[PDB]
Design a binder for this molecule. Structure first.
Ligand SMILES: Cc1cn([C@H]2C[C@H](O)[C@@H](COP(=O)(O)OP(=O)(O)O[C@H]3O[C@@H](C)[C@H](O)[C@@H](O)[C@H]3O)O2)c(=O)[nH]c1=O
Ligand SMILES: Cc1cn([C@H]2C[C@H](O)[C@@H](COP(=O)(O)OP(=O)(O)O[C@H]3O[C@@H](C)[C@H](O)[C@@H](O)[C@H]3O)O2)c(=O)[nH]c1=O
Lengths: 377, 382
């Protein structure tokens, strides 16, 4: 590799549109990708007043198929080469070489993934030079410390450089933990907001159901998402199956992402259910007694919180300022993260099988800042 | 296919041994010449310091077995198989193929770790050792060359690598550079004791530092595509912008050294020319002729080329990282805080224009000696 794909030029051209317009830069809107923070960004973008703002979604990585656009029926699907002034508009711009998109004088950009912010910050500079205006504010939806997605390398510093941008920029952090993490590292933004995690609305409908706990160890297994430390969990399970003589009493199930069943020893297997419907997931939560969900990141992630609120004893990990142990009594937070400790803790929890306290009420009781932000654009 | 296990932490099985003297055991991935770079050479240099009169010495290879040629650099060492249990004073044991095999570990075997997975194993051997021989845990000596979790994205490897720093048993850290030490201190890591050795100019290079210099319009680039910390692709992108925005760029030669790669077209018929890894002599000559340098190190560690370039009269572009800012180490060093292609290009244009040394606050780099003056103080603790 001699070049860096993520930062392929994001060419713009002038447009005669005169109203204020919000532009959401997202990698994709396909259902296949409608998870992570792409759905959260779309939820937040939905909040902005379509009465005071035209809305255009710019796809930077993946083009949709007819099916995907069904979720955006009110949106006019338009090519980069056209320059329509619709109120709602979707433009595919993943294939950018020698092509450009019409950027208006008062186009405001909302970034998501770090490379979308990277591009936005360069479009803003082009914009102010072209139209002879002071730089407009960028809205930056920060889902995680994205440099952490890479080892120390080019991508790492490029991703981080988007946080060191000195132009007008408003950060909206996913979770307060993430915000405080950024504050500690000394990053600066024109303004800072955040939205706290909130229990999945479907799941909340089952949180009061009666629970018939079984001897089930529920694992959040996502081999493809390194932050979830799938391989570390497997290694821990293997030691657990070997050192714990009552392990045969337990079922060990994996949910989140489909993978092959994994032999742990003693004929015991890690059984993958892949990604269940929220309904089935809810049912499985009610029956399960122990949970394992790791998140190598200041962000808390959702499954640990969901598991705790369904009466599971949950094994999770500290990271810097994050320690979920004081969020909820059901949460067990390991500081030393290795297979042996997870196994050991797991044996303790199993033995204790023969809820209580919560300091995260906000979770079951969020974009109230949207309007305060609308006044700033 | 899907990785279900973690290769770096394959079990490091030990068995009891009757050897009774004190013995130092160096855990290194390899001693092959092909790998005799990075910190493997530094660890061997430091291990060389320990008094062979007071200590038996065994080197345990954890990743790569040598070939007859490689062992030529260790002629005084008896090359022995894991299955044998000899009490030689100097010994090398290959232990990269470990499954169903063991290595004899004596009551008073002391371990010196290098790469994080070697420390990971050492810490587990120590536990096995104290249980087996009914003794309190022995001290581990940990030679820390960098914040090795940084070698990975947030993941299993990351936390495993870091877990070696959170080990609560007796452990002495020897940091490569004070910057690295302070970096660890800031993150709040704890060790039984802390030492460090400051960077010292390559002895061969020092022989040329006083030669007369005939500076040419050469931009010298530390290019190592395989070492991500050196941000090779970031540099290339920066060069491309530089070639496009700078109208006097045709006046300059742009050369890459460190690791062999194909020549890279930057535009305007200009190419990044790779010389691969030069001999220290040729490297020295090239340094004397060059006027501008680019050397990046995404890590608290300063790395050597930026320092070498500065002391040969080059204006050097490098990067800040956390507590590291080499700009106040030496006047020839230009440190960028915002690290992107545009800024590197812009800075590069400034430096070229200024072409139409002075101040140093890192004298330690070309002075004294005895950078391992702590060795004997450490020997008293084992
Ligand atoms: C393990 C599992 C999770 N899930 C859902 C429930 C979890 O909340 C969600 C976690 O996936 P993530 O990509 O980490 O986050 P997410 O963005 O998909 O989920 C979030 O959606 C928001 C709208 C809600 O307000 C949040 O509470 C949260 O549910 O996945 C399933 O549908 N089936 C499963 O088997
Ligand atoms: C660019 C270049 C560097 N080099 C050498 C000189 C640099 O010091 C060395 C830097 O590579 P690294 O793997 O980052 O570090 P290193 O471990 O290989 O080198 C260090 O070894 C210590 C024992 C010495 O005391 C130091 O002076 C230093 O040489 O590479 C060449 O031989 N040829 C080259 O073309």
């Amino acid at each position: 590799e001699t070049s860096i794909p993520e930062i392929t030029p994001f060419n713009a051209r002038t447009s005669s549109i005169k109203g204020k317009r919000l532009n959401l830069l997202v990698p994709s809107i396909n259902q296949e990708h409608m998870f992570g923070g792409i759905s959260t960004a779309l939820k937040l973008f939905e909040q902005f007043d379509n009465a005071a703002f035209a809305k255009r979604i710019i796809l930077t990585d993946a083009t949709p198929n007819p099916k995907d656009l069904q979720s955006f029926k009110s949106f006019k699907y338009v090519m980069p080469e056209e320059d329509k002034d619709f109120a709602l508009q979707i433009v595919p711009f993943n294939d950018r070489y020698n092509r450009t998109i019409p950027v208006a004088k008062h186009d405001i950009f909302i970034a998501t993934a770090w490379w979308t912010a990277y591009a936005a910050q360069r479009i803003v500079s082009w914009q102010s030079d072209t139209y002879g205006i002071p730089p407009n504010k960028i809205l930056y939806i920060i889902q995680d410390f994205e440099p952490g997605f890479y080892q120390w390398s080019s991508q790492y510093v490029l991703a981080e450089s988007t946080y060191k941008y000195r132009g007008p920029q408003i950060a909206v952090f996913n979770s307060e933990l993430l915000k405080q993490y950024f504050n500690n590292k000394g990053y600066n933004f024109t303004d800072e907001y955040f939205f706290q995690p909130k229990i999945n609305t479907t799941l909340k409908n089952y949180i009061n159901d009666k629970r018939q706990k079984e001897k089930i160890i529920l694992v959040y297994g996502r081999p493809s998402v390194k932050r979830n430390a799938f391989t570390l969990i497997v290694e821990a399970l293997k030691i657990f199956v070997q050192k714990y003589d009552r392990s045969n009493e337990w079922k060990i199930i994996s949910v989140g992402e489909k993978h092959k069943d994994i032999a742990l020893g003693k004929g015991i297997h890690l059984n993958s259910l892949g990604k269940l419907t929220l309904e089935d997931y809810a049912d499985l939560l009610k029956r399960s007694s122990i949970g394992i969900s790791l998140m190598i990141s200041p962000h808390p992630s959702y499954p640990p919180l969901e598991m705790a609120h369904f009466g599971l004893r949950v094994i999770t990990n500290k990271y810097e300022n994050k320690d979920l142990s004081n969020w909820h009594s059901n949460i067990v937070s390991l500081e030393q993260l290795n297979p042996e400790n997870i196994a050991e803790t797991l044996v303790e929890l199993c033995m204790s099988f023969n809820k209580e306290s919560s300091n995260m009420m906000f979770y079951i009781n969020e974009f109230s800042f949207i309007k305060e932000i609308e006044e700033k654009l």
